[model samples]
Target: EMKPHPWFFGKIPRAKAEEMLSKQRHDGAFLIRESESAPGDFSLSVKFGNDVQHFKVLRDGAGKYFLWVVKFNSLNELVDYHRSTSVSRNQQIFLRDIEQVPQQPTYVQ
Candidate 1:
C-alpha cells in the first residue's frame, strides 16, 4: 500500500473526491493499458476516518489506476503541528501509476 503524501491527508472534501472518481470512470482519464505480455487487472482502494473501500477497474498490466482523496481536521493538534512545521498536512488527490487515456469513450450512453 502507498502511504499518502502529507499534503493530502486533510484538505479535500468528499464531493470533490467523488467528482474525481467520476471523471476517471467516465472520461477515461485514469485508465491503465498494460503491455501485451501482461495481465489485465486493476484495483482501487481508499481509507478514510474509520473506513476503507476498494474498487476494481479495467486494467491491462500497463499499470494500476485509482483515484483517492482524504481530509482531516485542520485544527487538530497533530495536524496543526505538522502544518506549522511545513510538513504538508493538507488533503490531497492521489493518482497511481496509471496514464491518462486519450479521448476514450465513457461508460455512460
Candidate 2:
C-alpha cells in the first residue's frame, strides 16, 4: 500500500535528500521527495556515480505519475520499474535499494 513507502519523504529539501543518499553504499540508492519547485509534484533523487541526479515526476490531469516519457499509475509502480530498468539508457542509471527513512509516527492532528 501507499502508506508503506518509506522512500517517499513527504516534504524534505533537496540538500537533505542528497545527504541521505550520499551515505548509502549502493550506487543506485534512491528516494522520492516532494518537489521544491512544485509542491504537489514529486522529485526522484538517485545516487549516481558519486553524485545525485534529480528527475522531476509530474502528474497529469488524470493523476498519472510520469518522468518525462514513461508513465506509472503509482509511485510504487514507478519505482519498481526503475529498479530493474535504467532511467536513462545512455547513462545506465537504475534505481537500487530505496533509502528508507526511520519510521517516526506523526502525532499532529
Error of 1 at 34 (Å): 12
Model 2, 1-109: lDDT tens digits are 6466557778899999998888887777889898877877889998887888898887888998877677889988888888877876568888877646566988987
Assess every candidate by TM-score. 0.20, 0.80
Q: Any runs in candidate 2 off by more than 4 Å, and if so which?
A: 1-3, 99-109
Q: Can you list the residue pairs that collide in candidate 1?
A: 7-90, 8-91, 8-92, 10-72, 10-91, 11-91, 34-60, 34-61, 34-62
Instruction: Provide the lowest-lDDT 10-residue window in model 2.
Output: 1-10
The per-candidate count of clashes, in order, stands at 9, 0
lDDT to native, each model: 0.31, 0.82
Residues 26-78 of candidate 1 have per-residue lDDT tens digits of 22122222222323432333332233333333322344332222223322332
Judged by whole-model lDDT over C-alpha atoms, candidate 1 comes out at 0.31
Highest lDDT against the true fold, candidate: 2
